[PDB]
Amino acid sequence: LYSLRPEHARERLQDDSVETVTSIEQAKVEEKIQEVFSSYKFNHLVPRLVLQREKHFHYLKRGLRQLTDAYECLDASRPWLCYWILHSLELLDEPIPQIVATDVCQFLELCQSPDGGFGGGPGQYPHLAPTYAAVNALCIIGTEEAYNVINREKLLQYLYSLKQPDGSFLMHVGGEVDVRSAYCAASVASLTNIITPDLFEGTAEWIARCQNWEGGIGGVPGMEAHGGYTFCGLAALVILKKERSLNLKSLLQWVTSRQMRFEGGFQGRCNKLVDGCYSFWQAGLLPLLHRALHAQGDPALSMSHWMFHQQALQEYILMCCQCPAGGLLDKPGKSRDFYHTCYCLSGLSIAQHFGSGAMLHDVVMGVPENVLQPTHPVYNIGPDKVIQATTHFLQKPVPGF
Amino acid sequence: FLSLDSPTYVLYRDRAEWADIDPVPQNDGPSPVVQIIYSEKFRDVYDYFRAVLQRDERSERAFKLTRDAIELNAANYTVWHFRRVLLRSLQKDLQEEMNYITAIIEEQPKNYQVWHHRRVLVEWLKDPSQELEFIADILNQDAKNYHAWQHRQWVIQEFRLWDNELQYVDQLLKEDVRNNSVWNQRHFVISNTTGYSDRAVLEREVQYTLEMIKLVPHNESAWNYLKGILQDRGLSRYPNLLNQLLDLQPSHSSPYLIAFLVDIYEDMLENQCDNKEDILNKALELCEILAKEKDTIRKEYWRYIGRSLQSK
């Protein structure tokens, strides 16, 4: 394993003897991770990376039905819980009962607002985060019924209701503004085919203002480059077919710098710590950046791998981010939840599967049963559900008015 | 009026001033999914919220209730919205509300609604007088709270409060020179006040940054900052650069020195230079060292820079 090797130990943190609050914390994670790495040596077994797929399935399968009061804090993020669970199962190649999928469809219909979009639960004001989630859920199911839950004529009204003169959108009426709104609107509007000519007017320009001196993208122009916002920005530009509104060179140097030499997983910001959900937000940026670069006819691009260590990210996840009882997590010690479950898995799948036209170099770490279904690097739903949804809505006219 | 934590807290259903209203329960549908088992207390406040809201009862009791609804789930943006409506309608003392949101943010400094609610009040009041001091207190508990820095940039930008922020950035950079939020803030500030076009400023910056590098050579932020402030004019328009950095090869080396050199070389090539053939050889060797020995986590990127360095 790239990680359990002896030279990899030189990838340990160089403190410079000038220790700050950052060195300290980083060095702490590194030790807890080292332990996991050396887990094998101390115990005298041969290393066998395996994805506790059954344990994970039973966790997800239960949460799709009911959660403890520990989830009272995500009571305004219910379409998210459907998405995270229904996508983890989707990647684990697990089943979505013709009855459960309906209930999900029926529940989301209750979340949907008469003004368009979706709320965090029955009766909540529509918000772009839950709308993005509800739409991705409905597409993962992908049936006349699910698709039919989405009110496209109302969704455009709503999208237009949030649209800002400078190109940005609010997340909800009277709500905040940051790149998530741009990606959320772009993802749902494109999939459901409601993109008019002036919908995203000036949106690519605002998103390009979020790109700062680091090569990365921040929440709003002027802010620190962050991995979850950089994915929202890049993916939003890929949808709008405007990746080129950014300096892709520096964006590439920035994203690639985010992978932890010693841990293998990614960090959300320069000098922060690794975190499993970033296995998708950050690593997902390379496939996006492959297309982008090859699109401008780049020669130096690989025909088998992404521009990050696919091996190291799969070791990090398999070894360090898996919960014995099921579910994945931030890093060792951290508790499990459906968000990290949905994102460590999405990142594993990004890491295991490459593409480049007709090239297909999958890399599956450990037990080959560890390979996951594929996921689309823009929507983060199976590439088939994406294709299936867009075309179905494509036979509907954009809500012209 | 009555704490959710008080030993003598009573359910809204058991309340005398809340009997004329019927608690509207959540409708998750005959066959629930991702259904949360709320506590009797969580369900109680919310059944009453659904009703007051549903009635659009813009009352004082409704006001006091959102407070409890917010404490049970501060991330409930719908309740936060109805509360702003009550703020306007009931014509509430906003400064008194500034104090409320101040305490709530201290509690959940990573909540999106609380920061936005605060921003709405400051706008209503057109008063940014408490901001930099409040933020600095939050950044004192977590020097990298994204919401705190973002809110900070808004107060400075909008109210044009730039004068003492570089002094603040310097303070925090003294506390943790690896604080990327501060390196970014320093750029936000300089680039919005004087800019980096001023030779004296540019020099002062590169000097200071070359210092932080020749002090904590493996601190990436200082490297991405120095690169950031120069790369926007051409690293190759700075002859002395390659030298001073080359001087740090054995005294302050990290794969950052090598990566920066690979970046200068790239620009001495874009701009064409004598010895370019050797330059390209030196640069590709560095790409192989970083790719094979010096920084293999990104061997895919480093060899790709080797291959692009071929074509262009």
Partner: peptide, 4 residues
């Protein structure tokens, strides 16, 4: 990680 709070994303909303």
């Amino acid at each position: 990680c709070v994303i909303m």
